[PDB]
Design a binder for these strands. Structure first.
Ligand SMILES: [Mg+2]
Ligand SMILES: [Mg+2]
Ligand SMILES: [Mg+2]
Ligand SMILES: [Mg+2]
Ligand SMILES: [Mg+2]
Ligand SMILES: [Mg+2]
Ligand SMILES: [Mg+2]
Ligand SMILES: [Mg+2]
Ligand SMILES: [Mg+2]
Ligand SMILES: [Mg+2]
Ligand SMILES: [Mg+2]
Ligand SMILES: [Mg+2]
Ligand SMILES: [Mg+2]
Ligand SMILES: [Zn+2]
Ligand SMILES: [Zn+2]
Lengths: 136, 179, 50, 52, 116, 46
RNA sequence: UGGAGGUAAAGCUACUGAAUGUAUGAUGGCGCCACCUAGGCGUACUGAAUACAAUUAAACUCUGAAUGCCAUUUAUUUUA
RNA sequence: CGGUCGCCUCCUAAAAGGUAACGGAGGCGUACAAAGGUACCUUCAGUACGGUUGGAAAUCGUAUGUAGAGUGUAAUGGUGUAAGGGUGCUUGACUGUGAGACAUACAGGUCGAACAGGUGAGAAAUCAGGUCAUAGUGAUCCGGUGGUCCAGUAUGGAAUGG
RNA sequence: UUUGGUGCCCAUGUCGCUGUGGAAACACCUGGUUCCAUUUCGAACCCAGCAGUUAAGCACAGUGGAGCCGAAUGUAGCUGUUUCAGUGAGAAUAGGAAAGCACCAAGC
RNA sequence: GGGGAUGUAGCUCAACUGAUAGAGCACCUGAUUUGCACUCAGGAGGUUGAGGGUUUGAGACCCUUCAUCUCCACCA
């Protein structure tokens, strides 16, 4: 469970996912990568599912990198509560993925499982994923 | 001082030939002997500090200025604005007098003056001497502070190289092991 | 509110002409400054007045 | 009007008890950038200087 | 930590900044600079940034560094200023304490028709 | 600086074995204070 | 045409936090030495220093617009 | 029902100013006869090395380090020869005023050149009408106190007012 | 033109390294008896003199090491109308860079 | 906003009206019982709330304050 150790402000304004790709746009640690095609809010819970999926379908020597991190939190008012009396309490942490950010990358194992591994990682996530390779 | 004139002639000649020094003032020159016998007991037994000053006075001939800490510490009961430590800086004629009096009178009275050197230069050419006890200094009567302490006599030089500082020390015959 | 104010009166015409502040807890001794007086039209000692 | 001197005073420009810049003579105001990396701002009142 | 000249420059920067901040009547500025050997003097004008009058130990051909020749230097510079028709001056040192040679130069300048 | 109550007066110092009358400024009695171990009376120096 | 600004963007070796991955890895680090207590060293290492390569921010900024705002110049219009 | 009611700082506030919500974070109802005014002198914190008590860290010497230090305070802005530290002399933490501006429904608030009187610092220029700046505050009525070149219900006082 | 002083500037002006220099001047330096000074030290400030001095500082030449500056193209954001025309950043890069502009005194 | 009175060993109190501070309790010691208390007696525990003024003589009388109390008042 990826989680920030501490934050200065518990309840910050939400960060928009509309726009192009600011950083984490090109595979730079591995050489195959899972790029996004639709900006959306994906939470820290989805990261472990995608990471666990990759790890379960990995081998004994494959290596993986997680680029995005759920820095920003979001709140949720308790049920049956009318609006007012302050902001709700933070409930879950989401990483902001914009269209074009490389989320997961893999290297150091043959071609077929890596394509399959990235596929299973992207089926656990709501965004529409796509496979890309590293420029020589 | 006659020995000051001896310093003049000897330091000039020996150092210049020893390193082919192109100028007479290329030879190293000693600047200031700071003495700092400081104690935090002035935080509680302030009287003690007062007596200290007079002894320091009696040691150098310059009255010591009491120094104050630039911070505050609870474990040492320290707080800013208090006087913990005296420092004296001798120059001109008085500085060479005190140095000569130390090396010739005070130091060989030390219980076991075996010396410490090579492992004392600060990397900039300085030198610190950590005295352990005050009674050994001749210019001190048996009546003194209820607690006995040492001293932190230090040295300065015109040069910045520690090796050349050692050369001045050897030329001055400051008595340390091999240095 | 707290009352740290005090009144300063001349020592020649014994008139109170100024209002300033003073901490009775910290400063125990009465103020004895010298300021301009409208009546005497000169500088003169002004002391604290109850 | 500012809280802390964001614009330095120049010639014919004064300062107050609230770091407020006010003029000292007739003229046209004019801003000039100065200081390290041109990060300091300076204001001045260039006198009419009609001088016939 | 530094050398004497740098501290004098530091004091010199302070004095020039204060004068340029407060000199509202655009008076001529009589800067005296004292060295180990000699002491010189120049009357700048911070509005035009040029030198109108000058005087120095080098100009007067004296073995200077004494309070005696400081009086002569002050008389010459004050004579030159009067011919230039400027009498409202501000007197600042090169960054040295106003005393000895500087005080003698200033008093000599005041007694020769200057207003400062 | 000056105007002090503790005057630094040039006192001479003798020692046993080697006389070695070292004259040094100090604020003590203006007489021959005898030192028992001087510099020359030390195994380290010689 | 001049000026004020610090947003969009971008960047985090330019700070404050968050923080991917990695260069080497001081130190702490287990055992072994070594010592009764610290270490050197095989430490299934962790962690500094600095770095590389990559990230995040309404209350982060070494930067950084356009629009908009103020004033002035020219032309035209209205007696508001 | 719970919470709030005045004032100050930041964000939301969309690079002039202004802009709301039971939106997100904090303080204030002061302190200083020096922490004011002036003249002079002076400049980080930390870290590295070397040194009795003394220790990770008290103080000393030297170097490095461009602010992470200080600037009484909640933040913001400013300020490293400054607005920070020290010393000497002082009380301008003055009197009567006040052209012109900011911001404002009003009431109120804010800055201020300059004049006259008499001072403080300084050789002088100059500075001083409280502090680096923004919170530290409450109208009217009523009564009390001091002064006073005004009134004193026929006149002189007094009472009572101004 | 060069040295010394100073104002404007506020790193393409810095930090550092390697060498050269002094005629006059700048500096260290020689002493504290005078004016003046140390929260203690003629260290500094202030005196009166230039014996020694080119280590410093200072001034010149080289040094692209650190720091600093940074083109064009392209791109992100903006304004309109388009789903294309202007506006055009930040980052990165080739690369520049061992300051510059005036006044004064002296031998020139 | 006045009027009066009080302030003394650590505590509770005499106040020793000027011809030079004491008692019970708190505490130390001694005696004191099989033990615990109880009991008895010494010692210690006082800069007289603080400052000023007057006499040769004041904690004590006068002035000024500080804290406390009781009274009154107590229509911004
Ligand atoms: Mg942004
Ligand atoms: Mg960062
Ligand atoms: Mg922002
Ligand atoms: Mg209610
Ligand atoms: Mg705005
Ligand atoms: Mg706007
Ligand atoms: Mg603050
Ligand atoms: Mg002062
Ligand atoms: Mg101040
Ligand atoms: Mg009423
Ligand atoms: Mg009547
Ligand atoms: Mg009547
Ligand atoms: Mg050289
Ligand atoms: Zn009066
Ligand atoms: Zn001997």
């Amino acid at each position: 469970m990826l989680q920030p150790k501490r934050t200065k402000y518990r309840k910050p304004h939400n960060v928009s996912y509309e726009g192009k790709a600011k950083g984490n746009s090109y595979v730079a640690f591995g050489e195959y990568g899972l790029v996004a095609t639709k900006g959306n809010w994906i939470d820290a819970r989805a990261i472990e599912s995608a990471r666990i999926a990759i790890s379960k379908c990995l081998g004994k020597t494959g290596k993986m990198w997680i680029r995005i991190f759920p820095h920003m939190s979001k709140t949720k008012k308790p049920l049956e509560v009318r609006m007012g009396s302050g902001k709700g309490n933070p409930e879950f942490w989401v990483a902001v993925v914009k269209q074009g950010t490389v989320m997961f990358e893999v290297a150091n194992i043959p071609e077929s499982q890596m394509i399959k591994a990235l596929t299973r990682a992207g089926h656990k996530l709501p965004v529409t994923w796509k496979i890309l390779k590293r420029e020589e | 001082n006659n020995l000051k004139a001896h310093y003049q002639k000897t330091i000039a000649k020996e150092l210049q030939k020893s390193f082919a020094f192109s100028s007479i003032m290329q030879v190293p020159r000693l600047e200031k002997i700071v003495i700092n016998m400081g104690v935090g007991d002035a935080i509680r037994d302030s009287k003690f500090l007062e007596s200290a000053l007079n002894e320091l006075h009696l040691i150098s001939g310059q009255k010591p200025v009491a120094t104050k800490a630039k911070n505050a510490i609870s474990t040492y009961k320290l707080r800013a604005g208090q006087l913990i430590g005296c420092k004296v800086t001798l120059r001109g004629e008085r500085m060479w007098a005190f140095l000569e009096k130390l090396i010739y009178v005070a130091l060989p009275r030390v219980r076991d003056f075996r010396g410490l050197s090579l492992k004392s230069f600060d990397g900039r050419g300085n030198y610190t001497i950590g005295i352990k006890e005050q009674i050994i200094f001749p210019e001190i009567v048996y009546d003194d502070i209820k607690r006995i302490r040492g001293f932190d006599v230090t040295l300065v030089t015109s040069t910045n190289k520690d090796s050349e500082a050692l050369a001045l020390l050897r030329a001055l015959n400051l008595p340390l092991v091999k240095g | 509110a707290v009352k740290r104010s005090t009144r300063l009166g001349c020592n020649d015409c014994r008139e109170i002409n100024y209002l300033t502040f003073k901490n009775v807890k910290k400063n125990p001794e009465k103020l004895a400054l010298n300021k301009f007086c409208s009546r005497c039209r000169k500088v003169v000692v002004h002391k604290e007045v109850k | 009007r500012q809280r802390g001197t964001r614009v330095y005073p120049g010639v014919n420009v004064g300062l107050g008890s609230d770091d407020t810049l006010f003029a000292l003579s007739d003229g046209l105001v004019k801003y000039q950038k100065f200081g390290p990396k041109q990060g300091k701002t300076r204001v001045s009142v260039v006198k009419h200087k009609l001088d016939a | 930590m530094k050398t004497r000249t740098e501290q004098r420059r530091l004091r010199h920067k302070r004095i020039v900044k204060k004068i340029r901040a407060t000199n509202h009547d655009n008076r001529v500025v009589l800067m005296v600079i004292k060295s180990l050997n000699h002491i010189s003097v120049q009357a700048w004008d911070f509005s035009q940034n040029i030198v109108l009058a000058s005087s120095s130990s080098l100009a007067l051909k004296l073995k200077n560094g004494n309070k005696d020749n400081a009086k002569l230097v002050g008389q010459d510079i004050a004579d030159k200023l009067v011919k230039l028709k400027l009498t409202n001056v501000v007197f600042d040192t090169g960054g040295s304490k106003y005393h000895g040679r500087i005080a003698a130069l200033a008093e000599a300048a005041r007694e020769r028709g200057l207003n400062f | 600086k000056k105007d002090f109550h503790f005057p630094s007066q040039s006192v001479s110092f003798k020692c046993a074995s080697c006389s070695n009358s070292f004259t040094i400024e100090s604020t003590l009695k203006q007489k021959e204070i005898t030192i028992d171990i001087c510099g020359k009376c030390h195994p380290f120096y010689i």
